[PDB]
């Protein structure tokens, strides 16, 4: 649901997410991590996720992240920078 930024979250939120005590969640997060359904990177500084591979069963809403919220908008930015490479070296392109 959250890629980076909000993906990182406090242990207490995971404690609420696992419906378990925050002290218990230090033990509980490890059990949830153990299932390892999705391979990722997890930091226990705040139990923040910021992990790697994940498989969503389906995308939320109308894939709003897939629109200019994340994708497409970044792609528009790249072509302008590609034009900057052309402007930087038009003669070299020949």
């Amino acid at each position: 649901t959250r890629p980076a930024n909000h993906r990182q979250l406090t242990f207490e939120e995971i404690a609420k997410s696992a419906k378990i005590t925050v002290n218990e969640v230090e033990l509980l997060v490890m059990k949830a991590l153990s299932v390892g359904l999705v391979k990722g990177s997890i930091d226990e500084v705040d139990k923040r996720v910021h992990m790697t591979w994940v498989q969503p069963r389906v995308l939320d809403l109308q894939q709003i992240k897939g629109m200019k919220d994340r994708l497409e908008f970044w792609c528009t930015d790249v072509k302008s920078m590609e034009m900057l490479v052309e402007h930087q070296a038009h003669d070299i392109l020949t």
Binding site: L84, V85, Q88, A89, D91, I92
Partner: protein, 257 residues
């Protein structure tokens, strides 16, 4: 001849209106002749020697009324008379002290590069004597040392050296450059340095300088809770900016072929 300009020398200028009348008559002297278009006609230059004396007293009047733009014009004009080759020009008691006053004035406007330029301007005066010239050169040694530490010594160095108005300007030009440090609660008292702005441990007079515009100069975080200074810091996010710099330099190395 050309009286009133030299006529009021005994009564210098109790009235500021007299200075204005003197300026109008000086303008009439400019109508008669330019300050120094050429070095020819040394007799006209001898008339300009009388003009130098009235300008020198006029500059003292400008300091007495604390004029800045008019004083700047007069000071530049006095420097131009010294600029005039006029080998015939006689030694002037007013000229030696006023050049020293100009050296102090440069500190007042914070022209530090110029202040050394003025120390250079009179090498023979600086030598060891010219006590009027010596007080600003000693002040310059104190200024690089930090005028704050020796400001009390500088203030009492001469009760009167013809710099009485100029020492008041020196009090006006008290340095507050020490402001970029922790103060108020974190340091609480900076009176130890002895600069007038940070002088006094906590009284309202100290508070007026200390809490001016909230805190001294007034920009930046309040000194009481200030993190030592601006504390801007730096990041390695610049690598993306450095990647943009890499595009320009790398493309050029290829561009040369």
């Amino acid at each position: 001849m050309y009286e009133q300009l030299k006529g009021e020398w005994n009564r210098k200028s109790p009235n500021l209106s007299k200075c204005g009348e003197e300026l109008g008559r000086l303008k009439l002297v400019l109508l008669e002749l330019n300050f120094l278009p050429t070095t020819g006609t040394k007799l006209t230059k001898q008339q300009l020697i009388l003009a130098r004396d009235i300008l020198e007293i006029g500059a003292q009047w400008s300091i007495l009324r604390k004029d800045i733009p008019s004083f700047e014009r007069y000071m530049a004009q006095l420097k131009c008379y010294y600029f005039d080759y006029k080998e015939q020009l006689p030694e002037s008691a007013y000229m030696h002290q006023l050049l020293g006053l100009n050296l102090l004035f440069l500190l007042s406007q914070n022209r530090v590069a110029e202040f050394h330029t003025e120390l250079e301007r009179l090498p023979a005066k600086d030598i060891q004597t010219n006590v009027y010239i010596k007080h600003p050169v000693s002040l310059e040694q104190y200024l690089m040392e930090g005028s704050y530490n020796k400001v009390f010594l500088a203030k009492g160095n001469i009760p009167a050296e013809s710099y009485t108005f100029f020492i008041d300007i020196l009090l006006d030009t008290i340095r507050d450059e020490i402001a970029g440090c922790i103060e108020k609660a974190y340091e609480k008292i900076l009176f130890t340095e002895a600069t007038r702005i940070l002088f006094f441990n906590t009284p309202k007079k100290m508070t007026d300088y200390a809490k001016k515009r909230g805190w001294v100069l007034g920009p930046n975080n309040y000194y009481s809770f200030a993190s030592q200074q601006q504390k801007p810091e730096d990041t390695t996010i610049p690598s993306t900016e450095l990647a943009k710099q890499v595009i320009e330099y790398a493309r050029q190395l290829e561009m040369i072929v």
